[PDB]
Amino acid sequence: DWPVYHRIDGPIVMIGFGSIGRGTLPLIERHFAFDRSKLVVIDPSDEARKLAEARGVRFIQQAVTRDNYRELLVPLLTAGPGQGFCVNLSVDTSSLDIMELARENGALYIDTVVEPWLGFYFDPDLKPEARSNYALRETVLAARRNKPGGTTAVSCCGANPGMVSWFVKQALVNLAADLGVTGEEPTTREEWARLAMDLGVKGIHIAERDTQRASFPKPFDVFVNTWSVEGFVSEGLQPAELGWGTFERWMPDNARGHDSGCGAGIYLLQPGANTRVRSWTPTAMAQYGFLVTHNESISIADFLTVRDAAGQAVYRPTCHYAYHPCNDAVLSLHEMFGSGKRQSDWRILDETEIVDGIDELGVLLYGHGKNAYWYGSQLSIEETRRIAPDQNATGLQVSSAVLAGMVWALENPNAGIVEADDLDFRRCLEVQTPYLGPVVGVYTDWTPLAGRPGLFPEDIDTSDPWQFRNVLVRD
Amino acid sequence: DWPVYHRIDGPIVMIGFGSIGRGTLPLIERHFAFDRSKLVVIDPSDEARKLAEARGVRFIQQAVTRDNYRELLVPLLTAGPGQGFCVNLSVDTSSLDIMELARENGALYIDTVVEPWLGFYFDPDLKPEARSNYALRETVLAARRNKPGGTTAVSCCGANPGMVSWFVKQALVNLAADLGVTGEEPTTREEWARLAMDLGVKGIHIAERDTQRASFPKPFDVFVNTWSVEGFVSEGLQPAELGWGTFERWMPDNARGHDSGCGAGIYLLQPGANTRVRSWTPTAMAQYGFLVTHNESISIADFLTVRDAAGQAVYRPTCHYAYHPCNDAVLSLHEMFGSGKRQSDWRILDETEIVDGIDELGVLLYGHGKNAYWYGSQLSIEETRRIAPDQNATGLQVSSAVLAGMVWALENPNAGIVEADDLDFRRCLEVQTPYLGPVVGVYTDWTPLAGRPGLFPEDIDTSDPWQFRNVLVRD
Ligand SMILES: NC(=O)c1ccc[n+]([C@@H]2O[C@H](COP(=O)([O-])OP(=O)(O)OC[C@H]3O[C@@H](n4cnc5c(N)ncnc54)[C@H](O)[C@@H]3O)[C@@H](O)[C@H]2O)c1
Numbered sequence: 001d002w003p004v005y006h007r008i009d010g011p012i013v014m015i016g017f018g019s020i021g022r023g024t025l026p027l028i029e030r031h032f033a034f035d036r037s038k039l040v041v042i043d044p045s046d047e048a049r050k051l052a053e054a055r056g057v058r059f060i061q062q063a064v065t066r067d068n069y070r071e072l073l074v075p076l077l078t079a080g081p082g083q084g085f086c087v088n089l090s091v092d093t094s095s096l097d098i099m100e101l102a103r104e105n106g107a108l109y110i111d112t113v114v115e116p117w118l119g120f121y122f123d124p125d126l127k128p129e130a131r132s133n134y135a136l137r138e139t140v141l142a143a144r145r146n147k148p149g150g151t152t153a154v155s156c157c158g159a160n161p162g163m164v165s166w167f168v169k170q171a172l173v174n175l176a177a178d179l180g181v182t183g184e185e186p187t188t189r190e191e192w193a194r195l196a197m198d199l200g201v202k203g204i205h206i207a208e209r210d211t212q213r214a215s216f217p218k219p220f221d222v223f224v225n226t227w228s229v230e231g232f233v234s235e236g237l238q239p240a241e242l243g244w245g246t247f248e249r250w251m252p253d254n255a256r257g258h259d260s261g262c263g264a265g266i267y268l269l270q271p272g273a274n275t276r277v278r279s280w281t282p283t284a285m286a287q288y289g290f291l292v293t294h295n296e297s298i299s300i301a302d303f304l305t306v307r308d309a310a311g312q313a314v315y316r317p318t319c320h321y322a323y324h325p326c327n328d329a330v331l332s333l334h335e336m337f338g339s340g341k342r343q344s345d346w347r348i349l350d351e352t353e354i355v356d357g358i359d360e361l362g363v364l365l366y367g368h369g370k371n372a373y374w375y376g377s378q379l380s381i382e383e384t385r386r387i388a389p390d391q392n393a394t395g396l397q398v399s400s401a402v403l404a405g406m407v408w409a410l411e412n413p414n415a416g417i418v419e420a421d422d423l424d425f426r427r428c429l430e431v432q433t434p435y436l437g438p439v440v441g442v443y444t445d446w447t448p449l450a451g452r453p454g455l456f457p458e459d460i461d462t463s464d465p466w467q468f469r470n471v472l473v474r475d
Numbered sequence: 476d477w478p479v480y481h482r483i484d485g486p487i488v489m490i491g492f493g494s495i496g497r498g499t500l501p502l503i504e505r506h507f508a509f510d511r512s513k514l515v516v517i518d519p520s521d522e523a524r525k526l527a528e529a530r531g532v533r534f535i536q537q538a539v540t541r542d543n544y545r546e547l548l549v550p551l552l553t554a555g556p557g558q559g560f561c562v563n564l565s566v567d568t569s570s571l572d573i574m575e576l577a578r579e580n581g582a583l584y585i586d587t588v589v590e591p592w593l594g595f596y597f598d599p600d601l602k603p604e605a606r607s608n609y610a611l612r613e614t615v616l617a618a619r620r621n622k623p624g625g626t627t628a629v630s631c632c633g634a635n636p637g638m639v640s641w642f643v644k645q646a647l648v649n650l651a652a653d654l655g656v657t658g659e660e661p662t663t664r665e666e667w668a669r670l671a672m673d674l675g676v677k678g679i680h681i682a683e684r685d686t687q688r689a690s691f692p693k694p695f696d697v698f699v700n701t702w703s704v705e706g707f708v709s710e711g712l713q714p715a716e717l718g719w720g721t722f723e724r725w726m727p728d729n730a731r732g733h734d735s736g737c738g739a740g741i742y743l744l745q746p747g748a749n750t751r752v753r754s755w756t757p758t759a760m761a762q763y764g765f766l767v768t769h770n771e772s773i774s775i776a777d778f779l780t781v782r783d784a785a786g787q788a789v790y791r792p793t794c795h796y797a798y799h800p801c802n803d804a805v806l807s808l809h810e811m812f813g814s815g816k817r818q819s820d821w822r823i824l825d826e827t828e829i830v831d832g833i834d835e836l837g838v839l840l841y842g843h844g845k846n847a848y849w850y851g852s853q854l855s856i857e858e859t860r861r862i863a864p865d866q867n868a869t870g871l872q873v874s875s876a877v878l879a880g881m882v883w884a885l886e887n888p889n890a891g892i893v894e895a896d897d898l899d900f901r902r903c904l905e906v907q908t909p910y911l912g913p914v915v916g917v918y919t920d921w922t923p924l925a926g927r928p929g930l931f932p933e934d935i936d937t938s939d940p941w942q943f944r945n946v947l948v949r950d
């Protein structure tokens with residue numbers, strides 16, 4: 001039967017019971033020992049309340065806000081007898097503030113995004129840089145510098161960000177092995193960064209193709225997705241953003257850097273969900289992805305940075321999302337951007353509504369001697385239904401990653417604020433893999449210059465096919 | 476009963492029997508008196524042959540080519556006893572050469588596109604300008620100058636190009652009434668151009684939204700459309716192209732004009748089916764259209780050009796397509812452009828396969844005192860099935876326009892080479908209207924600057940919402 005990894009000796013407070021909370025709850029119940037009355041879900045939605053009631057779990061129907069979060073969460077997380085676990089799977093709440101509160105009170109913490117308090121993403125007085133995931137991530141890095149060590153809090157540990165950081169490490173090990181390079185696997189950040197440098201990894205796409213399809217066609221004026229519509233649209237309207245590689249020799253006129261922080265990022269002055277990049281996955285082959293900002297675009301590039309003695313970056317990979325969401329989401333973006341406003345309504349596809357498909361999610365490492373290598377999960381909806389309830393394939397990759405991070409945090413409970421890049425990738429993948437379906441590594445000879453130039457002039461760099469100049473879709 | 480407009484006494488030579496030929500044949504049989512044995516259908520495909528054989532119509536299984544067209548077509552066109560009618564609904568054939576051959580032999584002629592001989596659309600030695608619909612149309616204008624008058628040949632008389640020219644005239648009449656502009660209805664090209672100028676029509680979109688949906692979801696690696704896949708992809712890979720208004724104050728860096736010809740056009744050095752424009756239809760409301768090149772973008776702008784005594788253009792409207800095809804076609808374009816190559820397979824949706832939807836096809840006249848006015852057809856698939864066989868709503872708008880043009884040609888058989896803009900629009904609409912479903916005029920206060928500027932800096936012209944600078948979507 002299913003492994004029970006650890007006892008949780010305190011309250012389990014799940015903030016948010018949307019598509020990810022609904023998929024994560026059964027995994028927590030399955031894989032951890034605790035008295036049932038220890039678990040409580042907090043979500044303002046009536047829909048969520050009804051589902052929670054049907055699942056027999058405690059539910060508090062309340063929005064967590066800047067004004068109530070201390071009064072609500074401190075008693076809940078400290079109810080005892082020992083250390084609780086805040087499992088934050090919400091929108092509209094501050095990851096930073098909730099994380100800090102959990103830490104101050106000795107509770108473990110995990111989330112899947114650096115979310116801000118409601119109001120931030122559309123605040124007209126914020127400059128684009130301030131709305132970037134680079135800037136949100138810097139608040140977490142600052143919190144870590146301010147209070148090193150202490151109770152473990154895991155930032156951005158879903159499928160992506162999250163699992164994909166573990167895939168990058170496995171992909172690097174595999175690339176080395178496939179070249180006949182043997183020996184000790186890297187242990188330290190610096191060693192991982194040098195492995196990427198030494199292997200000639202110029203950049204990495206988080207290369208995803210969701211092929212899940214519903215039993216009904218996309219309704220007019222309804223945004224359809226396989227996970228948070230609100231969350232997808234919010235990140236989609238943030239600036240396009242990427243970890244920026246040392247090999248790059250061109251950026252768009254509307255690209256901008258940052259004065260401060262880890263140094264690994266640029267952003268573009270346009271919304272990422274209306275920015276296209278040329279990319280590739282094994283099932284899609286060549287496809288457009290949307291250049292939607294993601295925490296790991298920065299965190300992976302930062303993690304794999306090699307600096308010289310003076311502290312100057314001398315190697316860093318480009319890293320960004322290249323997302324092809326489900327067909328109905330593609331249509332939803334075309335509708336939304338074409339209308340200039342959010343649809344009147346939205347819906348998230350339930351497993352009962354999905355007729356077939358997979359969430360093909362992996363990392364595409366390029367520029368090395370074998371050109372490009374994609375490593376990741378090809379989890380299908382049919383396998384999903386066999387192995388975990390109340391979610392689709394998109395959901396299960398995320399919920400199983402939260403499970404893995406929770407196991408890691410319980411096993412390493414004094415590690416301080418950590419990113420997915422800081423965790424033991426082998427342990428995390430050991431926990432997660434039973435929920436990932438086929439996990440495969442595939443080489444390809446495809447590059448962004450395949451078939452180009454066509455019959456129109458274009459600005460391309462034929463000396464270096466994977467340059468962002470060639471990847472970015474431009475007029 | 477259905478009106479039988481005229482007897483056709485000579486051969487009826489239908490070149491091509493794909494979606495439009497299949498929809499047009501039954502209308503020809505319905506609306507003209509003739510011995511069925513005088514029909515002949517020419518198409519290279521087995522699929523077409525079996526359909527023709529099922530209708531008990533003479534069929535010749537040949538591709539018409541530059542090498543064979545004279546020897547193949549002349550005996551068919553001249554078989555007698557009376558004047559024949561060449562109904563050209565093909566791909567890969569020269570409209571110009573076939574039209575000239577028909578005229579040389581006294582046969583009436585109609586088509587729905589200025590098609591070139593196979594090889595043109597992908598010829599790598601052609602400069603972009605030479606690949607343009609403007610250039611193709613100029614070959615037709617030159618033929619007309621070289622041989623004025625004579626046997627009628629109707630160029631580009633489908634739904635669009637074709638019908639939409641008649642809609643422009645009706646829309647101008649309606650606007651004049653609604654704006655209280657006095658004067659008699661124009662009866663010459665010069666008078667129509669002056670009316671458009673006097674009404675302050677800055678430009679016109681051919682504003683189309685196809686909402687037809689099939690009973691099966693879009694297959695991976697299959698291009699799906701409601702009419703010619705080959706034809707749509709060919710025009711989609713031609714340069715984006717538009718009739719260019721005198722009111723425009725800006726064009727993109729990759730726009731180009733023409734050194735010769737009617738003077739009415741520009742094109743962009745990028746493919747039209749991967750070029751988006753902000754537009755509007757009554758059912759879509761605000762939407763993206765694709766800026767796919769079309770004959771009428773040039774012909775309507777040219778028709779409505781006012782020149783001074785010296786012959787310099789002092790007024791001309793912008794005119795271009797703003798096409799939102801069916802959702803499966805939108806996905807097909809994303810797939811094709813994302814892959815960098817045509818899909819392995821394609822299919823045209825049959826009425827038996829379509830579950831619901833309309834082809835909302837009209838003209839959006841903007842810049843006048845009531846902002847914007849859309850006039851056109853909202854034909855549904857359900858109405859289509861009630862009134863005509865063997866076609867979907869897209870096909871019926873086209874086949875019924877061909878019918879109208881054929882009636883007009885029989886009633887005006889010595890009018891020379893004519894475009895849809897040259898035909899008597901009321902007679903054509905009188906014939907066509909029974910097949911158009913609801914035909915309506917709708918005003919809107921929408922403009923391309925609605926909601927702008929938003930979250931990011933944009934390169935807009937706030938002085939005039941309808942400038943192309945505001946309409947064109949930048950990547
Ligand atoms: N890293 C990844 O791989 C990954 C993947 C998917 C989702 N996510 C993130 O996880 C979060 C949840 O995604 P989802 O698909 O479950 O979203 P969802 O939209 O399905 O659910 C969000 C839930 O948050 C609740 N909520 C709203 N305001 C709240 C508040 N003030 N307090 C508490 N709850 C509140 C809503 O009622 C809703 O049930 C989102 O932030 C999303 O961006 C991360």
Ligand SMILES: NC(=O)c1ccc[n+]([C@@H]2O[C@H](COP(=O)([O-])OP(=O)(O)OC[C@H]3O[C@@H](n4cnc5c(N)ncnc54)[C@H](O)[C@@H]3O)[C@@H](O)[C@H]2O)c1
Binds near residue numbers: 493704707
């Ligand atoms: N103006 C408009 O509104 C409008 C609308 C739709 C289509 N069209 C045009 O009408 C034409 C027909 O469209 P469709 O949807 O019927 O296309 P289709 O692709 O369904 O059919 C094209 C037919 O042409 C035949 N063909 C190919 N090569 C040939 C040759 N050398 N000689 C004779 N026949 C040949 C094919 O075998 C096929 O049956 C296309 O050129 C298209 O661009 C115009």
